[PDB]
Amino acid sequence: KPKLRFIERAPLVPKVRREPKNLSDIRGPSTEATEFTEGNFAILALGGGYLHWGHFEMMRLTINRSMDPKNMFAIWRVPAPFKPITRKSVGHRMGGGKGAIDHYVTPVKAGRLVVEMGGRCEFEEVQGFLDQVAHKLPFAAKAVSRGTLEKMRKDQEERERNNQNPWTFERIATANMLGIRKVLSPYDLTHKGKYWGKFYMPKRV
Amino acid sequence: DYRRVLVCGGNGGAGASCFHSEPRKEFGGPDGGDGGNGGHVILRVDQQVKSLSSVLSRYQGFSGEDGGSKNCFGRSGAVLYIRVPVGTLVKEGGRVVADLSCVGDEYIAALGGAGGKGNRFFLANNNRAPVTCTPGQPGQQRVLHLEL
Amino acid sequence: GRIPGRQWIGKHRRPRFVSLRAKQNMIRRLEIEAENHYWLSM
Amino acid sequence: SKAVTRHRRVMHFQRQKLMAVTEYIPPKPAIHPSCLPGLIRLLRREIAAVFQDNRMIAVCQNVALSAEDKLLMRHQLRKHKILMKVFPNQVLKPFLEDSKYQNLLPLFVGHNMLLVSEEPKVKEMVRILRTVPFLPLLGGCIDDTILSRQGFINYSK
Amino acid sequence: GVIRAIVRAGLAMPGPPLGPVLGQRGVSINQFCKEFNERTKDIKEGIPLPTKILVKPDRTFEIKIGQPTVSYFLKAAAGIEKGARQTGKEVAGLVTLKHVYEIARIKAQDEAFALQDVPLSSVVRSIIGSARSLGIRVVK
């Protein structure tokens, strides 16, 4: 089945209980599906965000149309929309309780791989439409091969090791130098200053 | 001689659903104005026109404005007229939907969708605060073939 | 060109920019505290 | 506002100063480094063999001809034992010094097409060239004896 | 300008494949098919034949012809009327190397087709590749 599988709008059995909007699921680096699996090419998420069924349909249609079924194959590296987002009836004042489940979505964290391509095909043969899909995506995304991913990572360690600035965000935050922990989040100690909200700053060491 | 044309009638505006509120009358009642009708596309026969070069291959009947607040209605879509030579057979699927031979003759190809009602339209003694606002009906979209 | 609401508090605030003078002040304080760390380390 | 926002939230001025102070600083690589200081062998052996196989050689500039005209010229040449050859100057320039042809250096530049043979049908070849008033005969070197065009004409006559 | 056609010698006036295609430049279809039938009489009858007609600017015909096609020739040699579908695994007829050589003997002789390579290898390899692309196996 060398084609991208269809993703349902919502799980067959919905969540009766409304759950809170824990934005930590979008905040911070991704810890799952951060490495290539049975593929060579992928769309890397350079920022956190929520993927709707609309985004899923966009990705599926574009990739299926613009890939060769016999040689190129695609695989989802993100679960189908499962987190329920509730929208109150339009035009109602605040209060009265949490609204009903309007839609379903899937969280995605920075560094996460959304779709993974593979097969007998080089990187430039796929860069075009993968980058178009990345631009379409709701968060900063990049068409990254295994080689490009490793290259950018190694460049990150190179920047960290050769930066001539005596002062690093990690050093200052961990040491609580200027009392800056009065202004930083406890998560900043682990984000090392490279993450702000759902945005990831690759340029920053 | 022969032209395939895509006439798309206008779409009626969707009625608004709002409610009035003024200093000394807070619950002033519905203000949802009705939407304007879509402008029909009518092929009018023209004696001066002798060939179907003039007629375009894509006609989009103007859509009516949506109803506003304060019971404001929506300007209905203006009628789009396609000047055609005298003696122009109009066929959908080999149906000869029209002949259009006489001067002054005209055939309505795509009727603009009617405008949607507002809540004030449904206002009544029984219904003292309607929330309904019927959506503006879509306009007709058909492919007509013109043969001299 | 006006900033909606009240400056420095709302979602839309006056953009604030760091001057070289501010960076130098912060670096000076950081150096002082690095020396403090060294002298507390023994 | 929440910790995560659809827009880039405004950092506290202290955090902004922290980020600015901790920005990355690349190293300066001293003085600017930039401002600081088997088809090939197949052709090699083929040309080495050809230089001995051939007894008479000439060169021309058959680049002004079309596909069909070049094909017709090829058939006319194959009517005789003469074989036409094409090789890059990039690899022929070494071949001149390799085979000890110093006088041949200012002859092979641009499109050069050899006409190796052992029996001169040069009379009929020049006759064929005559009806096409272009494509001049160029200098050559028969049996290690450089011949100019006048030499070729004398040898033909 | 040169016009290339693969018409069958048996039927000199198929119609569309010659009329509209040749009429753009301006031709005499009667003379064209008369010369085509003359060549058909000169050669065996009922076989596709490539043509090398060159419509001169003077509105004159210079019809040049050579050997029959290669695909139909190989199919007939193998006793095949329609070529194989897969052509990678399917096969309908087998032709021996000796037969291939024999047919090649009368192949590298045409001028327009440019099949004038002195070595036998250049022609035998080409025809072998053509047969392989076709649904024909090369015996031994």
Added chain:
Amino acid sequence: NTRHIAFSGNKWEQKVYSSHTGYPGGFRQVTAAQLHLRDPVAIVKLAIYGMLPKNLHRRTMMERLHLFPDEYIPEDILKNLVEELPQPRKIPKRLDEYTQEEIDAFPRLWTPPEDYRL
């Protein structure tokens, strides 16, 4: 010589002087070049006006400012003059102004190929 001032960058075209006559639609925005052509003194006058302190003494100070577009100056003003201030910007020299001795002194930087049109 206020007519002969020079702006750095593209200020001649980018810098805009805005005034408003007070009447509706009386907002006039005139580029620096247009203002200079209209009045060869307005640019310097406005620069000095904007640099002076914003109090009641500003116009008394401006009364002491004498701006002349060209070399000509009134005889009484010339007799009044006491000192000449050094020009804030040293005017760069042109090639036409450079002496042949300086041209020879400055080394040739590169060997131009002989076979070049130039």
Added chain:
Amino acid sequence: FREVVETTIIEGRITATPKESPNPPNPSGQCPICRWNLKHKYNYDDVLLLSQFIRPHGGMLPRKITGLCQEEHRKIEECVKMAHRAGLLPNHRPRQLNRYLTRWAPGSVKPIYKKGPRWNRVRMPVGSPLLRDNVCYSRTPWKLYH
């Protein structure tokens, strides 16, 4: 330098060509600028330096011929544009407001009718960013925008 002369019969003659001054301060350098130790020490008004890479009518000379680095060629081109706009090359012309350090062509910049607020002011560029790495003899870095 070869010049084409007509009389129609036309022919080219090679005339006297200048040569690099003897004893470069830094031999074995990539570009002439580096060879002569001028990496960050020439400005738009250094006409003596600039004109050595200039066609007689004012156009720049190709990098292949000049031998300059890519960045040095860009810097020279920008400095030459600035010098021409400042009128420092009166003799290198194709056949009145005084300016200098003009980054953009005078006829391609629109007036700043609505300068932004203090935090988003629309500044007028001065000089060129390509010369941002020039030698800095001042306490404060030179401002490229005014």
Added chain:
Amino acid sequence: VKQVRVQFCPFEKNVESTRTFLQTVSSEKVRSTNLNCSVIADVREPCVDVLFGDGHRLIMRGAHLTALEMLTAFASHIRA
């Protein structure tokens, strides 16, 4: 264009300008539309002559010239 003649002496010091000139312009890729011309390559400082039977003769001593210069001059003269 009426007639053209190209002459060069590769036996003497080589001059690639005229060689490239005759390789480029003196090709049937151009003569197909410029059929009016009559080319001749009499080879033996070099010389390219162009005879316009109306009133003109253009002589090019393509020693110090280059292919681009001589082609541009030829095109300009053809435009006349």
Added chain:
Amino acid sequence: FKNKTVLKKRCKDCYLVKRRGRWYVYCKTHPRHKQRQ
């Protein structure tokens, strides 16, 4: 001219030129391709 934030050459003859302060895609064969930044 069509105003585009990203200028793309459509055919072979389309050429990019920076005129009067902004980029333009000019085309002789298909002047339909005229684009302005």
Added chain:
RNA sequence: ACCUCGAUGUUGGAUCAGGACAUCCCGAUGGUGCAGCCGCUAUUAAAGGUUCGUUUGUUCAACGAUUAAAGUCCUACGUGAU
């Protein structure tokens, strides 16, 4: 739900209009499925203009007749110590 509940009802209309241009017309251009006329689309332009009637408070809307056009808005849904 942040100012005003220790005399400002509100919507329309009249009067006068100030302003933005995201231009309805008039001006200048590019493209066109631009032969011409009509047009469609885009750039630039806000100096000037942008109708009168029937029903209905009505803004709006429908309809009648026109116009080069009968533009979208903001101005305390401009203006009621007029």
Added chain:
RNA sequence: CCCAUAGUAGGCCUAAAAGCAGCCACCAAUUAAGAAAGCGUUCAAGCUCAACACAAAAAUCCCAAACAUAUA
């Protein structure tokens, strides 16, 4: 930038689809050009290509004036 012969219109398919509607194969000559990468073709014909050679906009009127280079 230059430049393009050709087994042949590779077969099946189809009225016919010939590199280019689809399927199977993708070999093969000439020093070299894919049984074709895109246009174009009803189909052809023709064009090149890979070859060989060589960012923004709103409504009273923009909004300190300015300044690129004298030493920390």
